[PDB]
């Protein structure tokens, strides 16, 4: 056990002395109070520690002890329905222990060592176990939590517990080599967990929003970014994705953000209902909250903890969705530490390894074949907060060159109170062509063509806007005023979505199909009618536009009849006038 | 020090219609007149020095042309004070630190001027202080901070320039002096962006 003493203190940094033999990125206990830190630089006889807690009141000369092991999490039953801080400590226990504020130095366990779980074995003596295989299961909130062998364990089974209630400390299986396999294990948060093979992304990740699910979709293992200035409503979109997506498990990482958002999740998710299993919504969610006024050095800790928990649940054969609340805050934590490491920085003060860290983090996502020969996925959706709304700063650019889809929020739409406020001209997605067979087989045989026609119409209206700007919209010919008007309709009747409405919040995909289909039918008929001398003004007064603009408020079970009525009403809106 | 700061209730008349009507300044108030070159800032400052209704005028020429100081010195003995019968120069104090005199003395001149104005206020008069340019004082600050190897703020200026400016402008105002009488000081600072 290497130990030394404090030599210098400044900010969240501590320089220890006499630490010869300590290893890079080991966890230490700083001071007599025992704060947690991590070695980030060795220099002769000294070590440079970044402390994960407040350092005010420390004194020169206190002990510093290295534990010899890098940061790690405890992976086992008992993580769902919970809330943790940046280094995996249960906040409910900290609350029932320290009151309404968070004091430093609390030591608590990640998993509760007293609750008893219903073990149910699935291996027999003499069997061969191999890293990643499943030993048994326990029930957890309507899931089936599989107990896995750690990735670095292999051997033969000597004894396996019969059944019944046990706590997570119980050696449910002991190998012929004498190792005891409890219900949980630890894993270093900086090492990606291994898999057998990576697969191709060919199933959509259904978010519930029309514009994202239709125009800019994401595959079940892809990555996405959503950067926007303050006031554009990033938190609303993130919480909507956490509410309505079709993931089995949601892991929500609030890195460096407002605390009221975490409280909103905590207070509201127990009252909502899980779309798939029908249970409460908090039973499929894991929060990792490290708010703005918490220690700075714990932000990257929270990011890594979140992604490791997501990879664990993926290893059990689930589809996980990871929501990183901001990576700009992580980058700023890095810059703050580098300020007193006295490094020579890159553009705008960020340390030079930042793009490498970002790539390493976004590359853990994907759809895999697990070590136990099963299928699971992790889908990352990270938010960016560019300083000054400037989309050219280093974090945003470093993110563009990695992600698969890119959802750009703009301020002009947010001022208009028109939400989701996704900039159509600046967003893209690289997953459409690979997802088209799924759409043809599961939505409708011509879904790709309707999507393409809507994209072409939006592009053509964008092209006309340039002339509309210099001559005014009344100077166009009727054939182009029609495109302007149908663009307005597409915008405010299909793209727009009400997050607080009881029925417009979640929108199935066949509903989006129907709406697109009837908008296109109307537009085609109106172009035909213009080819016959009908003026553009009475076309705008046709009262079937009310049906079209109201369609999105119809329930998912009431919709097919509505759409079948509306199609023939559209047809009659023009064939009957003759 | 003073006994009590009061609120200004009486206009400081400059003699120019646009300033006295549209954008008045009160007796103990503070004004700023920033103007690019060729906009006649010098004539306006001289007019403010020539026709104001203050009892005493303190003119601080912090890093500006010398012909302006000469204009004052030559013309003012001829002009008559409106309030009393005396010459205009009899109510004026000049501090002259022109553009080719030592740089580090511009700040000293600013502080000297405002201290003399505070003294005459303490005597019960109502003083007007015209700081002929504060960008020159800012440049002196920047030069000295450059000799000190300090890290600068946005445009090479030291990071404490706003504090010095605020502490200088905060010496103005209507007061009840320590002797019990009432005086005031009005500051009109020029800038040169």
């Amino acid at each position: 056990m290497i130990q030394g003493v404090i030599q210098k203190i400044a900010g969240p940094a501590v320089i220890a002395k006499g630490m010869l033999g300590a290893r890079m990125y080991d966890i230490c206990k700083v001071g007599e109070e025992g704060l947690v830190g991590e070695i980030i630089r060795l220099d002769g006889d000294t070590a440079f520690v970044q402390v994960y807690e407040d350092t005010s009141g420390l004194k020169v000369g206190e002990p510093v002890v290295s534990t010899g092991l890098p940061l790690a999490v405890e992976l086992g039953p008992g993580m769902l329905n919970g809330i943790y801080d940046g280094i995996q400590r249960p906040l409910e226990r900290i609350r029932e222990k320290t009151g309404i504020y968070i004091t430093r130095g609390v030591v608590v366990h990640a998993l509760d060592r007293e609750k008893k779980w219903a073990w149910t074995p699935m291996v027999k003596p003499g069997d061969e176990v191999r890293g990643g295989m499943v030993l048994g299961t326990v029930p957890e909130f309507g899931f089936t939590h599989k107990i896995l062998v750690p990735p670095d364990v292999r051997g033969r089974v000597k004894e396996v517990k019969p059944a019944g209630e046990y706590t997570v400390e119980e050696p449910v299986v002991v190998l012929e080599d004498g190792t005891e396999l409890k219900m949980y294990h630890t894993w270093p948060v900086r090492r990606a967990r291994p898999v057998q093979r990576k697969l191709d992304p060919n199933t959509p990740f259904l978010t519930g929003m029309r514009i994202l699910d239709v125009l800019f979709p994401v595959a079940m293992g892809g990555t996405a970014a959503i950067p926007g200035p303050f006031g554009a409503g990033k938190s609303v979109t993130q919480q909507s994705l956490a509410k309505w997506s079709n993931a089995d498990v949601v892991v929500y990482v609030g890195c460096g953000e407002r605390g009221n958002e975490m409280t909103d999740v905590l207070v509201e998710f127990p009252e909502l209902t899980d779309p798939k299993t029908g249970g409460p919504l908090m039973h499929r969610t894991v929060l990792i909250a490290n708010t703005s006024n918490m220690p700075v050095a714990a932000r990257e800790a929270s990011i890594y903890v979140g992604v490791t928990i997501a990879e664990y649940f993926r290893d059990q054969g689930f589809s996980v969705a990871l929501m990183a609340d901001s990576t700009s805050r992580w980058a700023e934590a890095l810059r703050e530490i580098s300020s007193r490491l006295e490094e020579m920085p890159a553009e705008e003060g960020y340390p030079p390894y930042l793009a490498a860290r970002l790539a390493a983090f976004y590359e853990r996502a994907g759809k895999v074949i697990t070590l136990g020969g099963e299928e699971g996925a992790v889908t990352i959706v990270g938010a960016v907060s560019p300083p000054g709304g400037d989309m050219s700063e280093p974090v945003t650019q470093s993110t563009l060159r990695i992600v698969g889809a890119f959802w750009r929020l703009d301020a002009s739409l947010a001022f208009r109170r028109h939400f989701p406020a996704i900039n159509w001209n600046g967003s893209y997605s690289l997953f459409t062509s690979a997802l088209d067979p799924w759409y043809r087989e599961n939505v409708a045989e011509d879904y790709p063509e309707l999507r393409d026609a809507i994209s072409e119409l939006l592009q053509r209206e964008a092209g006309l806007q340039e002339i509309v700007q210099l001559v005014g919209p009344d100077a166009l010919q009727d054939a182009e005023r029609l495109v302007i008007e149908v663009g307005r309709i597409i915008r405010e009747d299909f793209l727009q979505q009400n997050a607080y409405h009881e029925v417009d919040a979640y929108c199935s995909m066949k509903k989006a199909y129907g709406i697109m289909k009837m908008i296109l039918a109307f537009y085609k008929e109106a172009e035909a009618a213009i080819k016959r001398g009908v003026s553009i003004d009475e076309i705008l007064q046709l009262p079937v536009l009310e049906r079209i603009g109201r369609a999105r408020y119809v329930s998912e079970e009431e919709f097919p009849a509505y759409f079948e009525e509306a199609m023939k009403e559209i047809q009659g809106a023009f064939k009957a006038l003759a | 020090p003073v006994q009590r700061k009061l609120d200004p209730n009486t206009p400081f008349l400059t003699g120019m219609r646009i300033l006295d009507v549209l954008f008045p300044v009160a007796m103990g108030g503070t004004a700023a007149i920033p103007g690019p070159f060729g906009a006649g800032k010098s004539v306006t400052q001289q007019s403010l020095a020539k026709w104001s209704n203050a009892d005493v005028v303190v003119y601080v020429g912090c890093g500006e042309r010398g012909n302006e100081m000469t204009d004052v010195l030559v013309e003012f003995p001829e002009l008559t004070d409106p309030k009393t019968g005396g010459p205009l120069m009899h109510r004026t104090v000049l501090i002259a630190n022109t553009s080719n005199m030592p740089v580090a003395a511009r700040e000293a001149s600013i502080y000297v001027g405002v201290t003399i104005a505070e003294y005459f206020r303490d005597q019960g008069f109502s003083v007007a202080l015209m700081a002929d340019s504060t960008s020159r004082w800012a440049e002196a600050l920047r030069e000295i901070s450059s000799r000190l190897e300090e890290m600068p703020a946005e445009e090479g200026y030291p990071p404490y320039l706003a504090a010095r400016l605020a502490a200088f402008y905060e010496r103005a105002g209507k007061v009840i002096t320590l002797g019990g009488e009432e005086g005031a000081v009005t500051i009109v600072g020029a800038v040169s962006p």
């Binding site: 006295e342 020579m344 920085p345 | 890290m151 600068p152 946005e154 445009e155």
Partner: protein, 41 residues
């Protein structure tokens, strides 16, 4: 067109000035790390 060209050249001036300031700062801190690593040698 003249007004837009004016705005553009103004923005370009500001950006170049900021870049010059920060490279000055970088040079200073590099000189500093070298000095204070050599003095401890």
């Amino acid at each position: 067109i003249p007004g837009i060209r004016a705005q553009i050249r103004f923005i370009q001036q500001v950006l170049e000035q900021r870049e010059r300031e920060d490279t000055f700062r970088l040079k200073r801190i590099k000189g500093k790390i070298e000095a204070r690593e050599a003095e401890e040698e």
